[PDB]
Amino acid sequence: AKSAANKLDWAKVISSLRITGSTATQLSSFKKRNDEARRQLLELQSQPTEVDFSHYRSVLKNTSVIDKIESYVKQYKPVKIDASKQLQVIESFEKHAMTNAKETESLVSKELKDLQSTLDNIQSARPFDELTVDDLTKIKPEIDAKVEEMVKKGKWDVPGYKDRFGNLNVM
């Protein structure tokens, strides 16, 4: 249980490599270690909450208060119940947890195959020697669109060519 509680905490630290700067998840893990560490110490130092009427009371020959004190322990023996009040807001944190995780999982599951098909798309659809620029007009109207207003607005000169291909000047 105790080792099981933080066993899944060693899972989030592996999950924490991709998510850097976690404000409170580590703090919540820190909080769930802070209180839990307070738990084991509390129970180990917890003596049986009673006064030994056999020994610890008979050592006093002038008792006069222990029976009152022993009764005082017994009248408050039901000290106070637990507080399991969280049964509507705790799951409301979880209901957001189901909503966003499945939103993420549905997207990543779709995208991993969608992007994988893109890799299979590109490996066997590479017209690096036989593609048509008019086909590039067809694939993107922006390629078509970006040329007209280029002339009308007056940007006749076009840079960004000599970087890739030399101007091929004759001698």
Partner 1 sequence: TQLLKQNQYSPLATEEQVPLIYAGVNGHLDGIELSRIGEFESSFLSYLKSNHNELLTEIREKGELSKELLASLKSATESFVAT
Partner 2 sequence: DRIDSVSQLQNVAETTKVLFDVSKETVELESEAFELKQKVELAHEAKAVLDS
**Contact status: 10 vs partner 1 (CB under 8 A):** yes
116 scored as a contact of partner 2 (CB under 8 A):
yes
Check if the beta carbon of residue 73 is closer than 8 Å to that of residue 51.
Answer: yes
Q: In this structure, what token pair is assigned to residue 119?
A: 């890799």
Of the candidate spans 43-51, 120-128, 129-137, 161-169, the one that interacts with partner 2 by CB under 8 A turns out to be 43-51
Nearer to partner 1, 33 or 110 (CB): 33
7 binds partner 1 (CB under 8 A): yes
The two three-digit tokens of residue 129, written as one number: 């020697």
11 binds partner 1 (CB under 8 A): no
Say how far apart CA 25 and CA 46 lie, in whole Å. Answer: 31
Question: What token pair was written down for 75?
Answer: 């009248």
Residue 70 and residue 56 in contact, taking contact as beta carbons nearer than 8 Å: no
For residue 6, state whether it binds partner 1 (rule: CB under 8 A). yes
DSSP string across 8-61: THHHHHHHTSSS---SSHHHHHHHHHHHHHHHHHHHHS---SS--TTTTTTT-T
* Helix and strand element counts for the chain (H, E): 7, 0
Q: Does 102 participate in binding partner 1 (rule CB under 8 A)?
A: no
Q: Is 93 in the site for partner 1 (CB under 8 A)?
A: no
Residue 69 lies near partner 2 (rule: CB under 8 A): yes
Residue with tokens 């940007």: 155
Binding partner of residue 13 among partner 2, partner 1, none, CB cut-off 5 to 8 Å per kind: partner 1
Name the site residues for partner 1 (rule: CB under 8 A).
Answer: 2-3, 6-7, 10, 13
Name the site residues for partner 2 (rule: CB under 8 A).
Answer: 5, 8, 11-12, 15, 18, 25, 28-29, 31-32, 35-36, 38-39, 42-43, 45-51, 56-57, 60, 65-66, 69, 72-73, 76, 79-84, 86, 90, 93-94, 97-98, 100-102, 104-105, 108-109, 111-112, 115-116, 119
